[PDB]
């Protein structure tokens, strides 16, 4: 019971940490569509 | 010669006018593009 308990605990650590990285990555892609937009406005700057 | 002078003044003054007008027309033509830029940077605030 103790051994499988430890295994479930560490598994929860894995879950939390992976999930951390995931939320991070979706943040990243949000920033990528941003700097894509800011690019859009800098090209509109060029053409202006 | 008086007709001469007064006409020269008409012409200087005429081109000066069409300059002022042509400028304002350009001012509009630019404030359009600069306006669109400003819109897109609001969009980049959406993305952020």
Overall morphology of chain A: rod-shaped
Approximate helicity band of chain A? over 70%
Number of helices of chain A: 1
Distance between termini of chain A? Answer: 70 Å
Compute the CA-based radius of gyration of chain A.
21 Å
- Protein chains sharing the most extensive interface: A-B, 11 and 11 residues
Strand residue content of chain A: under 5%
Sheet/helix structural class of chain A: mainly alpha
Organism (chain A): Photorhabdus luminescens (Xenorhabdus luminescens)
Coiled coil (chain A): 4-48
Protein name (chain A): TcdA1
PDB class: toxin
Quick take:
Chain A: Residues 4-48 form a coiled coil. This is part of a larger assembly, with two copies of chain A (48 residues). With 48 residues, chain A is mainly α.
């Amino acid at each position: 019971i103790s051994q499988s308990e430890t295994y479930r605990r560490r598994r929860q650590e894995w879950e939390i940490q992976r999930n951390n990285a995931e939320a991070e990555l979706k943040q990243i892609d949000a920033q990528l569509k941003s700097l894509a937009v800011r690019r859009e406005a800098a090209v509109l700057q060029k053409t202006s | 010669t008086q007709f001469g002078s007064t006409l020269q003044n008409i012409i200087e003054r005429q081109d000066a006018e069409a300059l002022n007008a042509l400028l304002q027309n350009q001012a509009a033509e630019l404030i359009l593009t600069n306006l669109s830029i400003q819109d897109k940077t609001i969009e980049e605030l959406d993305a952020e």
